[PDB]
Symmetry: D2
């Protein structure tokens, strides 16, 4: 029947109805998965948004910068899914880099305190999440994080590129640790998606050009307005169908990164 039938999966990172996490969660539920959701800060808002999912799922608070949150997470998840049950899947869909580290703001003018906070949330927390949740994961399990290909520099993405580069490195080490539990760890490198995070002059035309250029570069085409292909890719990694891939990066980007022009 379903790709993820009877799988118990934690999904972090829903803040709006256009969040990549929201669509991962939707597709997961459509594929039979039982979800536990984690949210940061605006919990009333997130509750409202998660009520728009196909099925009701427990919502837990998790600020990845808060050590007490991380320390209590496994026990809170356990209360949510019942004692004796474990997670088969964990989705990290969390990213942040202050504005000083982004966009038209000069690369050299981002204070390290700002960069450090961004690396904390966007890269380090992937290890933190794994640390907190691996002790309640089943063998055969899967941890997935969200990446945006940082192998080459580019305008605007700036210090977030550096954080993603750090994330890829972190992922390779998480895989070493996860392996001990029989759990895989991977990243999905997504093409650009018009989530509300796109906010990070003539931004509109330029973002549309990004869309047209990415679609042209991608041999199978690309639609920035549609998170679904990315959500399906995450679910694939959550499933039993990529059992020998770990510490690795799957590109759900239309194939654009394989083409120079």
């Amino acid at each position: 029947t379903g790709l993820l039938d009877g799988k118990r999966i934690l999904v972090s990172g829903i803040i709006t109805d256009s969040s990549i996490a929201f669509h991962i969660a939707r597709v997961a539920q459509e594929q039979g998965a039982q979800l536990v959701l984690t949210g940061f800060d605006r919990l009333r808002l997130i509750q409202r948004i998660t009520d728009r999912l196909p099925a009701k799922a427990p919502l837990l608070e998790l600020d990845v910068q808060n050590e007490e949150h991380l320390a209590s997470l496994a026990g809170r998840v356990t209360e949510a899914i019942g004692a004796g049950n474990k997670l088969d899947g964990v989705v990290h869909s969390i990213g942040f880099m202050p504005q000083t580290g982004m966009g038209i703001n000069p690369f050299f003018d981002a204070p390290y305190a700002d960069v450090s906070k961004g690396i904390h949330i966007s890269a380090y927390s992937y290890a933190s999440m794994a640390k907190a949740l691996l002790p309640i994961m089943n063998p055969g399990g899967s941890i997935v994080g969200m990446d945006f290909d940082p192998s080459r520099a580019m305008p605007a993405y700036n210090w977030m590129t550096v954080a993603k580069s750090a994330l890829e490195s972190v992922n390779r080490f998480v895989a070493r640790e996860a392996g001990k539990y029989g759990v895989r760890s991977n990243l999905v490198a997504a093409g650009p998606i018009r989530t509300l995070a796109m906010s990070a002059e003539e931004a509109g035309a330029q973002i549309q050009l990004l869309e047209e250029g990415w679609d042209q570069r991608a041999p199978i085409g690309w639609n920035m307005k549609d998170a679904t292909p990315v959500a399906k890719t995450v679910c694939a990694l959550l499933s039993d169908w990529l059992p020998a891939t770990t510490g690795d990066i799957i590109y759900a980007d239309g194939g654009a990164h394989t083409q120079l022009l």
Copy 2:
């Protein structure tokens, strides 16, 4: 099934240890309807394929044969019925003459030999795609088999060069395939104990090569964060089926590593 209703051509079965044999087995278990192609030893391939979960038509295909390639689409169509198309194609074909591997010095492989190996192992990926794309459905998937050649290694020699060529070919096939709504990708598998692999470890391409490849196998499992069972092609087969499925719809021109994660680890 993961592949329910899908029509999929699978090449490259020669024995029951063939990676393609296991791709076929898993695909069938997941509801796929198959067309098989075999090279040269058709009687062998017939009795081998007779041990798959379901019966499937077996077609002849020598990728060096222009007539075979030119007639392939029509022969496949006769196999699956007029009006039907393929949703999937598996290229599981490789060859490099002995002079191009093992303890034979790298400089001593004649180009005639290397060129044959590149023909079969790399170019045929393009020519198969050319042959079959006009009878593939949008949403379709072409998959080939790779052995990561980004770094040199003992004994693999000119086959390494062939695989590097294959990776480059794959990126261009994706450009063509995309015009049909079809994806093209490679699976880079870890080392699998096929009959040939065991022979190599046992010194068939020379004793020094054997010892080196024995070490390669062992280091592979050591480096793989989830470990690596060289006697089990199933994880590789599942990965191929993942790419044949609707669940990786935005991946093309790319390489998926079904290697236990070994290529992500230095040691």
Copy 3:
């Protein structure tokens, strides 16, 4: 000399086994005029640098110190004379607290520790470039030190993550540096027997880590087609000087591997 007439800032000398010590030595032998920066143990650095081929001014620089960075250009200018500019900058600076390496579990490094290591090892490459670019000549060259982090490995742990960050930072520094006609690159060196390296092999970060890194060293020379002498930083120093010279004028945002070719070989 390869670097005749060039004015070059070299950071990162702490002892006579420092990679930067040898970069400085070779640069001076090739006609370069140096400005040195030292962190914290200035008396030690003074007597160490006193053993270089020529005397060079020594300036204080803690890359975590905003005042140090803000005054650096002016202090360098006082060192080399008004009207003169730097043709070269060497970043040879790395640190990661012990919790972020060795047998200490990867999950147990507090972020405060990791963040300090990333500050010193990666961000400071940007901030040094910011500090010094306004007093660099067109044709100039910024070089930093890298240890290839494309694949994970034992014990290196969070320093690996720092180096991955450094590589990404380097690509952005190149975008800024290019506006001045300045190149930015990293040299990925093979493992060098510094005092710290020997300590690690001898179990200073834990016995299991020691054994793993001992094996890393040996496999490195094994895999390197020209071999690798871990007791000799000179080939690494020469490579840095190559990038500081006029002979790689079209390379920027990039990584040169001075590792014996080991990263090109699986085994």
Copy 4:
């Protein structure tokens, strides 16, 4: 004094005065190197062109598809540089792919006989050259070939991209063999240069756009009309200043391959 003083270096691949090899040879001679030149087919023409170099150098015939040429090469070189002397450097600057494997001609319509010939000349011959010349190279020596970054597909370059991908693989193995002699083997991945090989509709404007785009992508800028930066990079690899790099690729491309946009 000179970067390559007293070094004996073989340079293949001069066909015109805009050949990358011609400028490698010019810069090498300016840096004190003694050269032996090899040429293919139009030897009268090549002689005329090589007379325009800073210093006279022996010209030897070498069709890399001709096994007798390869077999006699070391002895012919030895006659050129005198008995007892050896080569310190070898430049492979040779490339060919028939038109069917290029440009507007559909990727699928290149016959393998055409592709095979291109791979023979552009990739396999790098191993052949090394095989023929390594027995007369000094330890500390250097073999360099010319590459154009094939890690991603692109319009027009087509099957030549596949040949270059093959070349990079060949180079990693040549390095294993060259190492036994104390010799390095590397490739220089050049940005696009307006040599007469650029011939491979509105080609002019498009080639100019290639120039503007490459210059923009390259953080240090790029001039397609100027082979000199590439020639200097080859000489660097020929020199004693990159003694620990082998089996590797140096990018003389303005840094363009390190930037997505």
